């Protein structure tokens, strides 16, 4: 979770330049917290 939030804030500093389409992906990567934050989903994924 800390790694994801850190990457999003790194995107918050620098620029989504049109000559390098990398940094939009770290902004889109924020969604995966929606699994890790719910403890029930953490339990089920750890059971898998």
């Amino acid at each position: 979770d800390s790694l994801i939030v850190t990457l999003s804030l790194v995107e918050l500093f620098l620029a989504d330049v049109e000559g390098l389409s990398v940094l939009r992906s770290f902004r889109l990567l924020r969604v995966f917290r929606l699994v890790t934050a719910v403890p029930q989903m953490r339990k089920i994924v750890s059971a898998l």
């Binding site: 500093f13 620098l14 620029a15 989504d16 330049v17 390098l20």
Partner: peptide
């Protein structure tokens, strides 16, 4: 003067050298 980094840029006050106006001053790849 040119806009210092981390300041809300606009059409009339551009940023300084090495930055792109994207509603504020943002740096570029090293």
């Amino acid at each position: 003067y040119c806009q210092k980094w981390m300041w809300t840029c606009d059409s009339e006050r551009k940023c300084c050298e090495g930055m792109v106006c994207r509603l504020w001053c943002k740096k570029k790849l090293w």
